[PDB]
Paper text:
In the RAM network, the hippo-like kinase Kic1 activates the NDR-related kinase Cbk1, which forms a complex with the coactivator protein Mob2. Here we describe the crystal structure of the yeast Cbk1–Mob2 complex, providing what is to our knowledge the first structural template for an NDR/LATS kinase–Mob coactivator complex. In each structure, Mob2 binds to the conserved N-terminal extension of the Cbk1 AGC kinase domain, a region previously identified as the site by which NDR kinases bind Mob proteins. In all three structures, the Cbk1 HM peptide is wedged into a binding slot in the deep cleft formed by the kinase’s αMob helix, N-linker region, and N-terminal catalytic domain lobe.
We used two variants of catalytically inactive Cbk1(D475A) for crystallography. These differ at position 743, a highly conserved threonine and the phosphorylation site through which MST/hippo kinases (in this case, Kic1) activate NDR/LATS kinases. We collected crystallographic data on one Cbk1(HM-T)–Mob2 complex that diffracted to 3.3 Å, with one Cbk1–Mob2 complex in the asymmetric unit. Cbk1(HM-T)–Mob2 complex crystallized in only one of these states, and its substrate-binding pocket was blocked. We suggest that this is an auto-inhibited form of the kinase, while the other state seen in one of the two complexes present in Cbk1(HM-E) crystals may be competent to bind substrates containing basic amino acids (right). In our crystal structures, unphosphorylated wild-type (WT) HM region (HM-T) and HM region with glutamic acid substitution (HM-E) associate with the Mob2-supported binding site in a similar manner. Based on these data, we propose that the unphosphorylated NDR/LATS HM (HM-T) binds the kinase N-linker region, but cannot shift to a conformation that orders αC. Our structures show that there is likely an autoinhibitory HM binding site in the N-linker region, which would further hinder HM phosphorylation.
Residue numbers in the entry:
A (entry chain A): 294 to 391, 407 to 508, 553 to 714, 740 to 749
B (entry chain B): 111 to 148, 161 to 278
Amino acid sequence: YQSSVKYAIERNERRVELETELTSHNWSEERKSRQLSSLGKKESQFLRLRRTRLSLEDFHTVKVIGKGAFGEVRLVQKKDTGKIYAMKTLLKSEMYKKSDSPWVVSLYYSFQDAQYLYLIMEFLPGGDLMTMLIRWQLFTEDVTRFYMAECILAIETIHKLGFIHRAIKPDNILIDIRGHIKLSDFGLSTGFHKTHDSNYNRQQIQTWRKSRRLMAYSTVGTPDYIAPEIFLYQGYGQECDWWSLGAIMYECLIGWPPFCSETPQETYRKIMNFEQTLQFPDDIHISYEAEDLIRRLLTHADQRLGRHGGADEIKSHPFFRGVDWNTIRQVEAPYIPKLSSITDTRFFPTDELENVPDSPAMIGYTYSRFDY
Amino acid sequence: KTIVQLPKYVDLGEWIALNVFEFFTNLNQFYGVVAEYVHTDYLWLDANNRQVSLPASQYIDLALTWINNKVNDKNLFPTKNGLPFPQQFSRDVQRIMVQMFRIFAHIYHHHFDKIVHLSLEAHWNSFFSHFISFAKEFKIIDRKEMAPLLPLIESF
Ligand SMILES: Nc1ncnc2c1ncn2[C@@H]1O[C@H](COP(=O)(O)OP(=O)(O)NP(=O)(O)O)[C@@H](O)[C@H]1O
């Protein structure tokens, strides 16, 4: 009853909303006279729509798909109709920071509980590029060229919407039913590696780096890009994500990421070095142009003399013989997910983990236009 | 004026069921202002043994919550799909409109006192001017139960 002039400051935007919505109704009178046509009863029926009401439990959960710190993602069928949706669980406090393009996962609308935000997405049946690299370490060469490119165009779109991902990873990239690639988006999920760490029987480097894949994750987030301008300071720009590409590119071809450090802090370290710390292994197979790319991806993000200045010119690399860059989205995919159903989770590590140091423990549509 | 009038080519039922849904929510944020702290009259809920006397305001809690129960119902208020509504709501919505008129009125008679010290008055003025204009427009409320509002109404 101190802040109850909040019912004042709100109820204006309540009247405000209420007004435009109705001047919107007058989007009618569209009036094609370019028709000498009917007559013939009427072509106008307006349902209209609704802001209705909603909730959880209006979705049956099928299986869990993946997990993250803020929360899990999920495969859900809407109880109401039946459908399949990618469902994201997020968190309100405590967690901080208080469209239209073929390339990125589709967030349609959102809704929330007491402590968790809920996101509803088109569901990608094909796992991610994390669980792929695992499945068969991509025997690549040409496999990789495809899954790049498709990555570039993904990325080059995002930048052109004035956005920098600053999260580009094996697990942050998803495979669709044609086995093509869409990246979704950071969600926006957050957190940072800073400032710096202080402490002060193998038989194969491959086998040694195979001390990777550690406790699922459910803690994370590791440097599978982390260009080294992020740590340190305020910075970046579009060139942020190209480093993540070379980071990534290097891994499908080599068998680990460049800086793979066996502790989460020996990256930064190595990565803060590269130069010295970048090394391609003695398991031989890489092209002269394929290596050339990585190094020019993985160099300093440097402007001044240079440009990059990029985002095409990457396409101008010899590493890409063809293709058109046009016909790309219809092309037979390196792996086309073979599925048992519209519910096949076959491509995800259903696992078990279940740890959320969060719970004690124990809707709206005010939108504008209409799909689809 | 133009706002509450049924828009061109909209089913009235939606247009009504939305409009009544807006209104409940607004009165309640307004009583949300007046939360706690608390001629003649008419009292109701009969027969049941009910409808007696002595609300002395501060009842309002179990009064509004029946709308809460009536307007959240799946079958009375078909949010779902294009499944239609019984339209007997036209009777029911008249109740929820008139039962809503009670707290409107009760807030006017006794508790309008505290409102003006907040300089939020014009808000409730308009919103109240909002409620009548709509339901009177659609004749959702008869002229005989507007008797307490009759001296306040005609100011125009
Ligand atoms: N739209 C989707 N469709 C299918 N699977 C998805 C979708 N979104 C996320 N996933 C899966 O869930 C995993 C991670 O979810 P995510 O939203 O990325 O968690 P996070 O903590 O927000 N971000 P991340 O650090 O990558 O886990 C992905 O790697 C996928 O396996």
